[PDB]
Design a protein around this ligand. Sequence first.
Ligand code: NDP
Ligand code: SF4
Ligand code: SF4
Ligand code: SF4
Ligand code: SF4
Ligand code: SF4
Ligand code: K
Ligand code: ZN
Lengths: 114, 52, 208, 96, 178, 48, 51, 45, 126, 102, 291, 342, 157
Amino acid sequence: TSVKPIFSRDLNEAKRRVRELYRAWYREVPNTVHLMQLDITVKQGRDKVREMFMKNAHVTDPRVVDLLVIKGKMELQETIKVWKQRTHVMRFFHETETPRPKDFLSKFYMGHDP
Amino acid sequence: EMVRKCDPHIGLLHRGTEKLIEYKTYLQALPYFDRLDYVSMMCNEQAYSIAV
Amino acid sequence: KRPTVRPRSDVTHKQLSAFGEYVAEILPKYVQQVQVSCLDELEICIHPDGVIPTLTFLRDHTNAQFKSLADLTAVDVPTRQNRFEIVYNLLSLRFNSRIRVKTYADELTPIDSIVSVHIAANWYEREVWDMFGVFFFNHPDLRRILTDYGFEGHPFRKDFPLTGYVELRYDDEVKRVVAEPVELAQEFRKFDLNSPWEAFPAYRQPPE
Amino acid sequence: GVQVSPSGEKITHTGQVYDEKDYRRVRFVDRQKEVNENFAIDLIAQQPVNEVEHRIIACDGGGGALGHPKVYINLDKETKTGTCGYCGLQFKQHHH
Amino acid sequence: TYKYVNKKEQESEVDMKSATDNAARILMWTELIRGLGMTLSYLFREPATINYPFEKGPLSPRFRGEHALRRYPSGEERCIACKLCEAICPAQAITIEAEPRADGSRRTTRYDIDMTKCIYCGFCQEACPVDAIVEGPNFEFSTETHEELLYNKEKLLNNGDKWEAEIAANIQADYLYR
Amino acid sequence: PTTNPPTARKFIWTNHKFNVSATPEQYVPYSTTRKKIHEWVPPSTPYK
Amino acid sequence: EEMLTNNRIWRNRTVDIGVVTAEDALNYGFSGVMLRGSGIQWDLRKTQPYD
Amino acid sequence: SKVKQDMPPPGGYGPIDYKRNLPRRGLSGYSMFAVGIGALIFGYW
Amino acid sequence: TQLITVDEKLDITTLTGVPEEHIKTRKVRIFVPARNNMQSGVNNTKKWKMEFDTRERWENPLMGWASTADPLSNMVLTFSAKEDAIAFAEKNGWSYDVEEKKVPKPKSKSYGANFSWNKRTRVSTK
Amino acid sequence: KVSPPKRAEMKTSMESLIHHFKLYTEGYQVPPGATYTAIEAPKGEFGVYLVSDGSSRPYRCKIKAPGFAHLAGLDKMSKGHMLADVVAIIGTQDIVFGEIDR
Amino acid sequence: GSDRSRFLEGKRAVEDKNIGPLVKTIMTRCIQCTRCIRFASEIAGVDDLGTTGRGNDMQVGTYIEKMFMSELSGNVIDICPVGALTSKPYAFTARPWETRKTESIDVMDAVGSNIVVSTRTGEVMRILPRMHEDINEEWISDKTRFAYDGLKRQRLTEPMVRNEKGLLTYTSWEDALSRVAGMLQNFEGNAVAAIAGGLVDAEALVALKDLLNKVDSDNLCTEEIFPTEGAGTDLRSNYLLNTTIAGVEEADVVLLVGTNPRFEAPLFNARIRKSWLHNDLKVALIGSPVD
Amino acid sequence: LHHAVIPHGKGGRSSVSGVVATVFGATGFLGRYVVNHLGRMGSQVIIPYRCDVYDIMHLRLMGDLGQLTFLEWDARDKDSIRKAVQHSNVVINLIGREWETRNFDFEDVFVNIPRAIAQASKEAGVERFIHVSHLNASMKSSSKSLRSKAVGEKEVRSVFPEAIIIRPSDIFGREDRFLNHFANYRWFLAVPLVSLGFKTVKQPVYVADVSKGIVNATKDPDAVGKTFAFTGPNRYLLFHLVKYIFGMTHRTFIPYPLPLFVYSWIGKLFGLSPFEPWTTKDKVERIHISDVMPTDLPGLEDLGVQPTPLELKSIEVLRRHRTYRWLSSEIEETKPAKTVNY
Amino acid sequence: RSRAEYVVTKLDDLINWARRSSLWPMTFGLACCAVEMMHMAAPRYDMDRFGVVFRASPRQADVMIVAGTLTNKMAPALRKVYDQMPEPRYVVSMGSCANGGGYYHYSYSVVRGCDRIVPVDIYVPGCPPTAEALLYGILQLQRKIKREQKLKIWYRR
Ligand SMILES: NC(=O)C1=CN([C@@H]2O[C@H](COP(=O)(O)OP(=O)(O)OC[C@H]3O[C@@H](n4cnc5c(N)ncnc54)[C@H](OP(=O)(O)O)[C@@H]3O)[C@@H](O)[C@H]2O)C=CC1
Ligand code: SF4
Ligand code: SF4
Ligand code: SF4
Ligand code: SF4
Ligand code: SF4
Ligand SMILES: [K+]
Ligand SMILES: [Zn+2]
């Protein structure tokens, strides 16, 4: 139950790196929307960034949080230098994906999947 | 037109041929190498055959 | 004599065994195992902390002179604790030799990067990180090199499916190339091409 | 031979034919359902039984290496002919 | 051994004749004129262009083209549903469903070859133990829809009946090598 | 094939067909296997 | 070679373009014709022969 | 039967040239500058 | 200074990149595969295997092929130990069912039992 | 047990047919172990690192391409140059991209 | 073995037998290993197979035209190493590398034999036994082995409701469940009752039991009758094979009352015969005398 | 049902949903989105066409292999109509023109073709028919097209009595002739609206929402025999709509009050063209008629589609008409037009 | 029949003749199949003899020939270079990778056919399809675009 750290000794500086990454993403969203001709608004993209952070927000292992921070910085750098396209950025919103309903009746009526 | 940095983004012709070769047998994975280097076909076949 | 079986020379085996003892006694701090294969190939398995000293010693030593990096590879064995085995194939042009240096890692313990030793390790470790998810410390620019932008997951891992999770198609409402969950017209038929009879008695594991 | 359904479409030699209420005949609307005119079971039915003199015959399908693997057929039953499992040729032992 | 492609052995010194030759080479474009001469020689050569579609390029009897299912001289289908063509097909472009026929013969009921997956590698025709599946040398079967390249048993049997005067002769001419 | 004619068979095509793409006699794929699961047919007589 | 090798246009396009040293090629992991162009005497067919 | 196999002739194949062959054409420099200067002077006159 | 402590279960589900439904709604089996009774060879009963639950496999309209919607259908993983398979499954966040290894029971075999004077194991044919 | 027999031997002999069947369905079993084979391709040193677990399918196949390292070295080669010099460098590294991307 | 043959002679051929439409015999492939003979002599207990002849002409099978059917008769198809004794329903259908293996449990009887279902492209193709030393060893009954083809006929695929004419017509899940739910909320406790058959799992049983208990119904009956007097289903030892199959192996006298175990539970009777052969089990029967 | 029409899969490209739909106006503007939704959810779509194979060829990627059957048809060929509707359980009618040709006019296109299609569908016994009319096409309107669409509604309801009639508002999209038309008024000097664009209320509806509503009407058991009103969330006056359109275009705004009779005269002048006309008379009074308030008719909420607003779906269709100078402008750079309750 | 429709048929024949005699491809190719494409360009088969001239930019192109495997990284770029061509544009899919995924059909980073991204007019099968079969596919495309009746459909409108 004792491991070698990656960057953060404990959870607090990992949260500090998370906060810095969120700061960079929040600053980058308006520039991304202005540069690449996105149909979305700036506030919608900030909602997207916030909810991605929220789905990742349940983890408490410092090494895993450091690796998620590193992947987020890679993703951010691919957003800074324009290597993603409009399609690559817009894949986050799942607007062409019909969402699977979570109700048991709907899952029963569609098919055999649980 | 003076160049200061070159960053070749690759993987635009990437197909996961190593994973496919892993999922197939040796004779089945033999023709993957011609399409690895489609200019050096029999050289690739020679390399794979010598390894096997 | 025998036209079917490959000829075997013992002088290469003895030379590689002597060099294995040489390297093992020079570096007892990191070297965990030294073996010579029947195919006359020398492998040294080291601690992950010893990547920098082992690679620097093999590159810069007078008797080693392994100045050329042949390749840098990861092998995913998902039954051991450190599942990613990192393999460094090196070539010595002075002594006309090839050496293999092995080490281990898992998803949460990165290993040191050898861009300061060999420059091909830059792109090789970028590929290894992109395909297996092994982080590299003190790398100049570690990022994806072969997968698509925004690709989730490392596809050369064992647990990653062959067909993947996501697939692309052109959508006409949005006039874009969109990504949707994978769905195949014909599923890849897996085959059980594993004979139930033991082929090689030399590699028989004792029963548990 | 090739037979037609009540729907009007021709039946394949394996017995496959689309129903009256299938939605999958729209793929044959303004096109044609391609079927094999020569039926293998009929063509092997027209071939006469080879009357041989030995108790065990050997078949390779003709042409030597251009045929099938060489298989041996035991012609002991006089109430039925021995059939090659590869080519379908029938053999009968001549007891006269 | 090895040889030098750009290193010169010693030096040719400086001579008035050599200097004047170098001056003529610089000023009068001598290598450009000899390149023009080689280019004009290729102009006055005879072209190597065949007259498609009225002329066709040479091939070998080993050629791998459109797939086909052959028959015996009796007319029985050669295939016996052993699925070696699937088990060796690297792209998994072959699907076989089989059942006993009305006379008990072992015959396929479904034999699909997805030619948009096929890599035209001849593994099926070299793994077939009865020479049923073959790659006939037809290559001019380009279609206008994706569906028309999804072959089934009836299409492959039609190909085998169409190209039988071709495929049997090619196997007769080539079979002693394999 | 005038001094060396090919072998004549009864199943060979007596008339050659060229490529018939974008033409009414083009090839259309279909599943050549019959139905697998046969459903239960309800009876035509009411219980009451 | 008559078309290209002695051509001054080709020589202006190719000479002193993309020069790489032997130590840099060895450290960067170059192989084949590039090491030979840099001057490193190395060939797999002559050093570790096969077939 | 004797084995028939794809074999070279027993005398071997003929010699195949592989060295580079520059024809070494053209004239000397002195004569061609002489022709040039003669053209210059004749045109001027 | 270079060695910290954590009291958790080593969850990497956010790092593997698998979508959420294929983590939460999936079940895996850890088992020694049973020997194929059409053969007597038992070399396939040596390594533990983890497989996934079977999802829907339907029929294609155009050709009748087996169309599927799950990605983890052909996924089988090989393990040297049951506890190693447990560690991998708990690390990847999949709920697991484990079947114990069915070793064949040792049996008393004697050729003289075929020819007993009084006992019932005497065989009437050879 | 490795290379398939002749077709006449297949059709006239039992064990030749058995070996043909098993080779063209399952394939030959490679004994477990790892190797690295380097062959002088015209573009450079084409290497393959093959790891076999004892089955008829390879456990791992890493494809070392010379062009991958050459394109990694493209950045140093193009210092102090222009667009035409860059396309000349791309040409003279003898780059194909199937072996690079894999 | 070797990789090339020195046999330059002609091979023998043996005429095929007709022992039944289950076990298809191509007896040229037989290598005379007597496994089927020993199985029929000891486990099947029929003594209907044997070797007729001498030397190279020795043939396995029945001398007369005899239809070989007892229970447990697909295990000769299992234990025949060559393809001489194959399965006629499985004939020419699929290949073992195609067939995906699923470890399941038999429901054809109450022994609970561990089985493998072999499925190809989303369709059940074969049933094989599994090695469980405490239940069924290496064998399954013929009904278990060859009853898989009944899952492709007379199968309910869509929900049906009675029409106003009185006929069953296809409908939607919403409509069918709405009708049944309306009748369920209409009717009270004792007016609602349920009867369970034989091929039902415990999940559905507890599901329907909970539903009927929520609608206050306790008439949760099964088709099979067990005496409810005394303890009944209260004590679990009252309705169980308490000695179990290892206890069949261990016991020395067995008294069978009112049962025909050969057809009611073929693997149970097979283990009784195994104990009778090896441990000299003393077997007695009260009931009609059956073989 | 039938065994081949039972739905399967997770609703992707390769799934089967059991919708066999003959879409008659699939080569138009709404038809491409309809066939996209059907192919995306997985359906056997029959596209009868009269234009060129290249003209329908953009539809060819919009489904899986073999899920789209293209068939030539003629509006005067009942044989072609019944061979198109022969194998279907849904028949969708999107046939319509915004002008009159020498072969087909408003009454033919909006009455005779839908009546023939509905008659062939009834003879073939298809389960479901969906017919797209227009909103506020009640009767005795100022335009010939809406009276023709009303007569077509009555004919379709007479022939196939349980037809799902969908009446959408002025549908806006990428290839529409509403927003692109208003933005292409910028090529002239001014925007000549009738009464300066006031007292004319319009509530446009997005083409993706219309197509989703059509698909949900194919798969909705409660939609049989009903008339739906596909309307947007916000009502705008015509003047404010044109002002917002030109604000997103960032071109200019010069409105002009020009009377209806002479504006219809110049609309007829533009419509007298052998090609596709820029505007017609029927176009200009269909623009200048107001859209009625949907009170009793069910809508997109009842069919399960939440109507996307024009303010959210406006920049994907007007960014073409901007110049370079205002190309990289976001949503919030333009003031949205004020909505009216009436 | 009437005189005007004969005239519009003759104008259809003229326009289709021009469009099939002048067929300029975009300089696009990805793989093995692109090597076979430039082997059609080689002097033996002579697309220049057939009237077919490479132009690098899609604006000067008529036909887009998908020669190679379409990866997930390549698909948006392919859709881009297809959309930026002018309207009289055609698509020739080349080889098994471009038709139906081919030898990488079960790959994570390969789309299963270029028809999932761009509308394909003619599929040329093979791996690689020879330059013979490629010249065949080009001639088939010429026949296809001769078969179009644009002005006749416009007149019958
Ligand atoms: N456009 C809008 O904003 C609104 C439209 N609608 C209605 O919705 C429907 C679809 O809209 P939309 O896409 O804009 O319409 P279109 O103008 O684009 O035409 C729709 C389809 O009708 C076909 N068509 C037209 N006339 C004929 C004819 N005589 N014979 C055969 N086919 C014919 C066209 O085929 P082809 O190209 O081959 O001629 C086209 O595929 C129409 O009925 C329209 O009135 C309702 C509300 C708003
Ligand atoms: S290998 Fe030949 S005989 Fe065997 S299934 Fe395939 S085509 Fe038929
Ligand atoms: S040629 Fe190769 S890829 Fe094609 S069907 Fe035969 S075995 Fe499969
Ligand atoms: S089990 Fe099979 S091989 Fe053995 S004797 Fe019986 S039939 Fe012959
Ligand atoms: S597969 Fe086995 S039993 Fe069948 S013929 Fe071959 S060797 Fe004999
Ligand atoms: S179809 Fe074959 S030749 Fe063409 S790109 Fe794919 S692998 Fe290469
Ligand atoms: K058997
Ligand atoms: Zn035969």
